Amino acid sequence: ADSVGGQQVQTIPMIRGARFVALFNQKQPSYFMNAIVSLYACLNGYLDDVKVQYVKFYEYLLVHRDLGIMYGTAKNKFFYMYVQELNYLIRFFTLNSPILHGELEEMLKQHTHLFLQHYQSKMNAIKSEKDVKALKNLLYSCKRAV
Amino acid sequence: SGKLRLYKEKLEGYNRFYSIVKTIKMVTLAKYRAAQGRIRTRDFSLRYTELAFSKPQASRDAVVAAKNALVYIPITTNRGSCGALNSNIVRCIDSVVSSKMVLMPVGKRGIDSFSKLYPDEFRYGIINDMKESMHFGYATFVIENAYEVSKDADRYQVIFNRFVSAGVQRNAVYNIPSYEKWKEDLADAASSDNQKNRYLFANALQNEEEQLIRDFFDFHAALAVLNAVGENELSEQAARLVAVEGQLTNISSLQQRTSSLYNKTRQFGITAALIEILSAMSSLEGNAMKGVRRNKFWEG
Amino acid sequence: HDLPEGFEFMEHKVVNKDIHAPHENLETLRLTLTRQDEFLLREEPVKCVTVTGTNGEYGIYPGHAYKIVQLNPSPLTVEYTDGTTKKYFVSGGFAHINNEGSCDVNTVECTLLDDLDLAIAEKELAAQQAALGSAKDDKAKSVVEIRISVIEAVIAALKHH
Amino acid sequence: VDHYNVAQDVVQMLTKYRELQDIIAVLGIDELSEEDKLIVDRARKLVKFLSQPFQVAEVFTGMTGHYVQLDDTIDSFSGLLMGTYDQVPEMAFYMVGGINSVLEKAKKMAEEAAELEKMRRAR
Numbered sequence: 001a002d003s004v005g006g007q008q009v010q011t012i013p014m015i016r017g018a019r020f021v022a023l024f025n026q027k028q029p030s031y032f033m034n035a036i037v038s039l040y041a042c043l044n045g046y047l048d049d050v051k052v053q054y055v056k057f058y059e060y061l062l063v064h065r066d067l068g069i070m071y072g073t074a075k076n077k078f079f080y081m082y083v084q085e086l087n088y089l090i091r092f093f094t095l096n097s098p099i100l101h102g103e104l105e106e107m108l109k110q111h112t113h114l115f116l117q118h119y120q121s122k123m124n125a126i127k128s129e130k131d132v133k134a135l136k137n138l139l140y141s142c143k144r145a146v
Numbered sequence: 147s148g149k150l151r152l153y154k155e156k157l158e159g160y161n162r163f164y165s166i167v168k169t170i171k172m173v174t175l176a177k178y179r180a181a182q183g184r185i186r187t188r189d190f191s192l193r194y195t196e197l198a199f200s201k202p203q204a205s206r207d208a209v210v211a212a213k214n215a216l217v218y219i220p221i222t223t224n225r226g227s228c229g230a231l232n233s234n235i236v237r238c239i240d241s242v243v244s245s246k247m248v249l250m251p252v253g254k255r256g257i258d259s260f261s262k263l264y265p266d267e268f269r270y271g272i273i274n275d276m277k278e279s280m281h282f283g284y285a286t287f288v289i290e291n292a293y294e295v296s297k298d299a300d301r302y303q304v305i306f307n308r309f310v311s312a313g314v315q316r317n318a319v320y321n322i323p324s325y326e327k328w329k330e331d332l333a334d335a336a337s338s339d340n341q342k343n344r345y346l347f348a349n350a351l352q353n354e355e356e357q358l359i360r361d362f363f364d365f366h367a368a369l370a371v372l373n374a375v376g377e378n379e380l381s382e383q384a385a386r387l388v389a390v391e392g393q394l395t396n397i398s399s400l401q402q403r404t405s406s407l408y409n410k411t412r413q414f415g416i417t418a419a420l421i422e423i424l425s426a427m428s429s430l431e432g433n434a435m436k437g438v439r440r441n442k443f444w445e446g
Numbered sequence: 447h448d449l450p451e452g453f454e455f456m457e458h459k460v461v462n463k464d465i466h467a468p469h470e471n472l473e474t475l476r477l478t479l480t481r482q483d484e485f486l487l488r489e490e491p492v493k494c495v496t497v498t499g500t501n502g503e504y505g506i507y508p509g510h511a512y513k514i515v516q517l518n519p520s521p522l523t524v525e526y527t528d529g530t531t532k533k534y535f536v537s538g539g540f541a542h543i544n545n546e547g548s549c550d551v552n553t554v555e556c557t558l559l560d561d562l563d564l565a566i567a568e569k570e571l572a573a574q575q576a577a578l579g580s581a582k583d584d585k586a587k588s589v590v591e592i593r594i595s596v597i598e599a600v601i602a603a604l605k606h607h
Numbered sequence: 608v609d610h611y612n613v614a615q616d617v618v619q620m621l622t623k624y625r626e627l628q629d630i631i632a633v634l635g636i637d638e639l640s641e642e643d644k645l646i647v648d649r650a651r652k653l654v655k656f657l658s659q660p661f662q663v664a665e666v667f668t669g670m671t672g673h674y675v676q677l678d679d680t681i682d683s684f685s686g687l688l689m690g691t692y693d694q695v696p697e698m699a700f701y702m703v704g705g706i707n708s709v710l711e712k713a714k715k716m717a718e719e720a721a722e723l724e725k726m727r728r729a730r
């Protein structure tokens with residue numbers, strides 16, 4: 001409310017509120033594991049370096065893709081987002097538990113590092129008449145894809 | 147119902163008029179506290195400027211003998227909402243109006259207000275964007291233009307606002323006599339016992355060369371202008387914060403008056419609609435007539 | 447409708463010593479170093495102050511005679527009774543010295559000599575020197591020479607110590 | 608997909624423009640940021656570009672109607688959203704058809720403005 005006029009200053013609470021208010025957009029219901037993981041990542045600051053426009057794309061890669069496996073860097077033994085049966089383990093054991101907390105942070109840290117290094121870097125370097133349109137279409141598709 | 151929602155729309159606008167004004171209060175409570183540093187670092191630059199120009203003269207003899215032009219340089223704010231500062235300054239200027247009055251007001255509001263009100267005395271005005279700090283260069287720009295407006299001027303007078311405290315903003319006047327009249331008074335303060343406090347100061351200037359004296363005169367004149375604009379800014383931000391409180395309360399009173407009419411309207415609307423329905427119900431009951439009862443009355 | 451003069455709100459006036467009065471032995475000079483209506487030092491007791499006026503350098507100690515000095519772009523030294531030194535650099539202004547033991551040095555700009563950079567000062571002189579060669583007219587050359595004088599004074603001031 | 612995306616962007620811009628209008632009303636257009644004024648300038652063109660003269664309302668309007676194709680509308684709005692026509696005068700979008708009519712009206716506006724300037728110049 002005070003931000004609207006006066007050049008909003010981006011404190012950490014604001015840096016994370018915007019991501020939360022931009023993860024809330026969705027078209028189809030989200031599987032519990034995908035939703036809880038994404039909220040946890042934004043809660044601990046893994047998206048502070050991610051622009052608000054690319055949050056949906058970041059979430060899509062986290063859910064439907066695996067950057068660590070793509071670049072041969074993943075070290076987690078069992079905690080992978082493609083294991084859809086981890087949902088009940090997460091329900092029984094909270095994310096803030098030694099069983100899952102260690103691997104969860106490792107995956108989020110690795111995924112965040114790869115995304116910033118490879119994808120967002122190219123996004124900020126888009127200068128063309130067709131690439132911009134392709135990027136815009138991609139972001140809109142990811143908005144209603146997860 | 148539209149009538150009820152008319153009030154709701156009206157209150158909807160009022161409810162956000164407050165938010166925009168509330169954000170403005172926050173904006174103007176940053177700049178007030180940013181310019182509060184002057185409060186600490188003022189009241190010491192103008193010490194020998196007092197001796198140069200401090201002359202508690204009468205308010206009639208100094209304007210009745212206006213042999214040459216008198217150049218007034220009122221200080222006014224660019225943006226409105228400041229309060230009564232500009233209005234008072236205009237009253238202070240209206241009270242001095244003369245045949246030999248030339249105006250070089252400062253600020254967009256000053257230009258617009260003084261251009262329309264006194265149209266054959268206004269010449270042109272100075273405008274500064276409130277982007278940088280009030281510096282010496284701006285003051286030098288005020289003085290240079292003032293001289294070119296009327297070089298053969300009896301006096302150049304700056305009418306500004308002094309910020310005594312957060313809630314006190316008085317009107318102050320720096321009067322700068324031109325070189326000829328200043329050096330004449332400086333000559334009398336030196337030779338004569340009159341003006342004792344200025345005796346040593348005047349003789350210490352007459353010993354030096356003339357160009358130094360002229361530079362001294364211009365330099366201290368600039369400082370006086372710099373103090374006035376600096377103070378007028380601090381009074382401006384302080385006044386706006388106060389004014390932007392008055393608007394909040396006015397917008398709160400309206401919110402309490404349009405809410406009552408909204409809550410009074412819904413109560414009346416419910417009552418009237420219900421009354422209409424019951425009137426129709428009674429009309430259809432009244433028109434109805436019971437027929438002859440076909441029962442065995444004898445067997446009772 | 448009489449208006450107050452802007453000096454009535456200022457409560458620190460200048461005290462002048464009547465000429466027909468006994469002398470006092472003073473060991474402290476009350477210095478007031480000011481920039482753009484802001485005092486860097488306020489009635490601050492200093493042992494001595496060294497200032498560069500147009501004629502030359504003046505070393506002002508307590509009891510110095512009444513004088514007005516037109517400063518030039520140059521360093522200014524302030525030495526406290528501790529013997530500790532504080533060096534500023536000024537671009538211009540005036541210095542009023544009173545026989546009562548006060549010195550009010552009002553400058554357009556007064557910056558500690560530490561803040562100034564010698565590397566920046568040197569490259570800037572080179573740029574203005576090229577302009578002075580190609581400076582269109584006499585007025586432009588005079589303005590450029592004003593900058594060079596200040597720059598060389600700054601460069602010389604820092605090279606001194 | 609392009610049709611859906613363009614429509615949503617238009618709606619969002621119009622919604623934002625209405626909120627910014629309150630600030631323009633209270634603070635003024637000057638106090639809006641660089642981004643906000645670009646939304647304002649683009650949104651106003653959208654508001655006027657939605658208008659269209661119908662072939663049956665010639666008597667009411669006094670101008671010939673236009674029949675805009677679906678593809679032309681999508682492309683015209685898509686370019687407007689991304690600022691392809693930021694330099695076009697605002698009134699060029701008022702009571703016209705496709706983008707081509709906008710350019711023609713802007714050209715006509717430029718010509719008459721030049722004539723007025725020439726008349727003033729002679730004076």
Ligand SMILES: O=c1ccn([C@@H]2O[C@H](COP(=O)(O)OP(=O)(O)OP(=O)(O)O)[C@@H](O)[C@H]2O)c(=O)[nH]1
Nearest residue numbers: 353354355358499500501502503504513514515
């Ligand atoms: O031909 C002259 C004579 C005098 N003067 C000027 O008149 C003034 C007389 O100054 P003073 O007589 O009061 O003192 P002083 O010689 O000690 O002055 P400084 O060099 O210490 O400043 C000085 O400022 C001197 O430069 C000239 O400029 N030209």
